[PDB]
Design a protein around this ligand. Sequence first.
Ligand SMILES: O=C(NCCOP(=O)(O)O)c1ccc(OC(F)(F)F)cc1
Ligand SMILES: O=C(NCCOP(=O)(O)O)c1ccc(OC(F)(F)F)cc1
Ligand SMILES: *Cc1c(COP(=O)(O)O)cnc(C)c1O
Ligand SMILES: *Cc1c(COP(=O)(O)O)cnc(C)c1O
Ligand code: NA
Ligand code: NA
Lengths: 252, 252, 393, 393
Amino acid sequence: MERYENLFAQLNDRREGAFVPFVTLGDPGIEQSLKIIDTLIDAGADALELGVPFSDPLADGPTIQNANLRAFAAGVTPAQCFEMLALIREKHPTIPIGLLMYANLVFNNGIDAFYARCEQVGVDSVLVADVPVEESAPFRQAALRHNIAPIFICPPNADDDLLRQVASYGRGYTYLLLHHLIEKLKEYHAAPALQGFGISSPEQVSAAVRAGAAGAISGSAIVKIIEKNLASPKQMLAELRSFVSAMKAASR
Amino acid sequence: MERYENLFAQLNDRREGAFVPFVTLGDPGIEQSLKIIDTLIDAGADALELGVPFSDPLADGPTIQNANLRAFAAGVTPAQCFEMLALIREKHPTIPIGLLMYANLVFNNGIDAFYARCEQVGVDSVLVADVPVEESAPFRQAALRHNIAPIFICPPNADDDLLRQVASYGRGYTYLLLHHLIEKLKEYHAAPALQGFGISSPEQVSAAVRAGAAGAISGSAIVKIIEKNLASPKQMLAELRSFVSAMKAASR
Amino acid sequence: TTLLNPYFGEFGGMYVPQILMPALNQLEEAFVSAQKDPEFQAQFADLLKNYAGRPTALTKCQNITAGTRTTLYLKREDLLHGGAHKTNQVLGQALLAKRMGKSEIIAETGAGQHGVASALASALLGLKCRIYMGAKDVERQSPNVFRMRLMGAEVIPVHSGSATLKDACNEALRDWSGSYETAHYMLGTAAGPHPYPTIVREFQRMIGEETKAQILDKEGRLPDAVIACVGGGSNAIGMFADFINDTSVGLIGVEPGGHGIETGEHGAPLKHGRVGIYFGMKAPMMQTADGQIEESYSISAGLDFPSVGPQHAYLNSIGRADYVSITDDEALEAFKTLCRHEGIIPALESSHALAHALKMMREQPEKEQLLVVNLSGRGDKDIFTVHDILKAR
Amino acid sequence: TTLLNPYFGEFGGMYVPQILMPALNQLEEAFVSAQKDPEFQAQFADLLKNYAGRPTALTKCQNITAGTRTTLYLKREDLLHGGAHKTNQVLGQALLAKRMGKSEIIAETGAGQHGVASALASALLGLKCRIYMGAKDVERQSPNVFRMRLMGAEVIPVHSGSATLKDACNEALRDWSGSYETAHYMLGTAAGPHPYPTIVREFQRMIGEETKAQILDKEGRLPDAVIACVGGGSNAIGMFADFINDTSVGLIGVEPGGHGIETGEHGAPLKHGRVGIYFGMKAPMMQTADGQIEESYSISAGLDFPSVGPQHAYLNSIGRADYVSITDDEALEAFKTLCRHEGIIPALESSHALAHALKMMREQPEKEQLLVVNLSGRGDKDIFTVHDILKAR
Ligand SMILES: O=C(NCCOP(=O)(O)O)c1ccc(OC(F)(F)F)cc1
Ligand SMILES: O=C(NCCOP(=O)(O)O)c1ccc(OC(F)(F)F)cc1
Ligand SMILES: *Cc1c(COP(=O)(O)O)cnc(C)c1O
Ligand SMILES: *Cc1c(COP(=O)(O)O)cnc(C)c1O
Ligand code: NA
Ligand code: NA
């Protein structure tokens, strides 16, 4: 499909940035995660980034390490996560859905098979946290064969060789961590840039778009709301809705 | 004095062996040791061998190690032992009294001074357990200058050179541990031999004399009686008297 | 782009987040430069000789082999400063950090030996050392924790995941990704992302080089086999490397069998795991059917790295090296045998290598064979472990 | 009659009961024969090289001496097999026992290091080893007791006297007097009756011989002073012996000062005891005014032999060697300093030698001096001792 391309064209027609929250699938449980994700969409999320719990998430900070542990406490498996993804896509046909994966979960039972499963449940992109562009060929190839966009991190100090690789290899969007990088990425016809570091307040959403990025990704701020409201599931959803509405409003 | 020489001449005139018990001075206390020693004499002991408690008696077996510990528990010092010796000699003018010493107690405040103290309280001999004949010159010289007989152990495997040294250097008696050694000691005009190993029964006393020794020394058997009867001081003396009378009778 | 091959056949690679790639590239270039630099080599040789005590002895074991046709030699890395082979490569990596202008050392540790080795190298060379260690391991390795702090290292308990070695590995990497301009990551085995499997091998390769010279001096020929335990792979590849091109010399690596391969309570991923991608590398590992990373179990905690160095997986795949397993009980018996018959207390790690040599001898006692066991460490650290088990019997 | 002088000036001798004299005479003759025997020397050299790991390194300590005019080297007996210098002379005595046709070894031990050293030598050379140890020491040295039994030695608790080292010394002698036709007494220091002070010196003299060669190689001159701790005297006389005729080289022995010489709770008989006769020798010792033998006290139990080797008393009396004391607190500070600044954990015994060198440096930091400390042992055994004291502060 072309869900990212459709979303960005529609957002451009409204002179609008995208707001993309990150949550861990199954945190703090399967049913509550499904409600959390529906609330994020209903509150105005333009796209989702969704992590599959992994034992050794060596690219995530403590807030997300704890989300993984909560999901594991509930017995959440990658198999169950794919069941969730199919339910989510069935409720929401057009929202782009990206996964944040660790390499072993992609490689485990076959790279091609993983991306085929992604295609079958309606996923749009996969960012493999511990696969640098230098190692990415079998991953991005399998992604593209199954109509999945491979997403790559563009680090703040990326040199020109890295910028060219990320521009050539990525699709869907460029995960972006003096707006020099944004201009070079556009110069190299990269996928539209989403700013992903330090997005916790509406002011940061507006500032990322003003710099020339197509939108902003916020995960820790969303996950911290889940963490803070564990004992009150209903207040959790209400606080999620309040926060995403404010963040999305800042992209208009 | 010539107490050993007088005793042996008198014993020879009676065709008699000497019986010599060994006890530790001050075991199990000063007053009871004084009674023990008086009982040994009254029961027929021909001479005494008396140990001064020392911290590291590395020539004594467990029975005598324990006697030393009992004396130390009672606070017995070499100074107190010499006070005891003077009292003993004052009660008994002719019985030969020999000390068994460790070298440090002799060397401690001066070798000459120790042997002068021996002479002043009426001691007749000193055997220094850890001074071999090869090291003995300052000890035997100081002994002889103060009319003290230096006693030397003649081991069962002593070679001819050692036999000659023991015969030349010893006085009073030779401490003896197929009666070959007894004959060689007499051939070399040694001091009369007292047999000191394994004398615990009257049969051993008679057998030592029959072999040609002038008598027998028994310590562990005497000390074991003290050990066995600690709770009953009076039965201890009675049992001491019974045992020494039997041992002395075997030398007639 | 790299200067050196990051792969050993299909195994190895550089599977780190993009932000860590410059750190690895910088490290590879400094290593390649240092290997061409006679002054770096001479400085490293000098520390190995005058501080660590190289060369280590090669000790014959006639008491153990009497009546058989086995001749057994022990390569005495137990006599190295620190009590284990780990000292060789931390000294080299410490010099590499200084070459790079780094003033801080990050290290991970499980049972604590690499923590101690990193701390002593750092103390000697004036580096500020911080050591990540799973909170469970901190609790059960107080002697090594104490050593680490006595030498001025900062020991940081990790509470994430299972709070064992693999989680200390994650936390060291997270730290290095943000601090690598001033800190070097002193990785503890011949695994992880390139260039670490290559660097650690080259900084341990004097083990095999010395063994070859010593065996030629004493026997006039190369060994029939050299045998080493395999937790992460550094002492085995250090023994193996100089013999790889000597095709007649068998290379035998011994993984921990734990309670038995069939119980699943073991530490033998090379022969009984499944290839995955973790710790920056494609290698056999302990993992669930789902692909979650698991622990290794051994009586010897030093063998509990849940994967294996990629060069070992490659050497196995082409048949150049053979890998076997030894159980807790076999290792304990070899430990007792060496104490009683040679007066040497071996590390329980090394006891796995010794145990397999003993089985080679005992199974075929009239087979002519000249064997070298890499005695990777001394076993003072294990005497209470061994005491408690023998008393519970 | 003896082949060799049993005395060092007034000190030394053969103060044993007559029945032990043939054992000493037999041992002296076998030793004098072995010292003429190139094959004995070559066998001993081979074990020292290929089993014990000699030569040991000589390590410079620039981190400790920076900014001063002291150059400090450590003679690394901590790297010897077993972790202390005691291994050198037990191997030689074990070969002596075999030369004499003996199949059994008797040994005494206090803190247990000599027990472990005697047990490992016996295991290697197929001797039946029995070790006497005061029951108080057995209770408080379980790690060394375990090592001793793992290597097949029989450990026999002594309950007599104060049931410490001096009482284990008595019991070993009592045993030897009746068993010396088939058993050799493996005495643990350079003390006791002749020929032991001479034999132990000669079986430890490679320490000083190597130090001389290593210092000439590295500095082009002999040391200004060599410094060693003195518990019984074996590591100090091993360092000293090859330098005695080099009159410009200071010889400094360091006795334990314990809580302070003035407290009386110390272990420094050479400078603060009184000459007596015990342990088969005339030497300074800890004793009451009455002449009963007392204990030494040190934080380091290995320094608690309550006398000193007669050759040290002689070297002091003629002014060839100087003897000083270091307190528990000074030794602890030197222990911490070496851990933090060189990554070496020294034995608390050896820390007394290091502490005195540190004071030599610190008191006169612009004095030119080239110093060698004999690092007699490693200090893994002491880390809990040091941990508890530093935590109680
Ligand atoms: O096993 C490892 N370290 C050895 C620890 O030494 P010890 O003290 O014996 O546990 C080890 C550490 C890191 C590693 O890669 C990566 F950094 F990515 F995690 C792979 C293996
Ligand atoms: O100090 C001695 N042994 C060293 C014990 O070693 P360690 O394990 O460090 O206590 C020691 C042992 C015996 C000795 O003479 C004699 F045999 F007569 F008693 C003198 C000194
Ligand atoms: C750490 C260690 C090992 C295992 O690690 P490798 O990298 O596999 O060598 C083995 N032996 C000892 C003594 C160790 O300390
Ligand atoms: C036994 C010991 C000593 C003291 O004994 P000496 O005979 O005086 O050497 C000193 N250092 C170490 C490490 C020891 O084990
Ligand atoms: Na492993
Ligand atoms: Na002493």
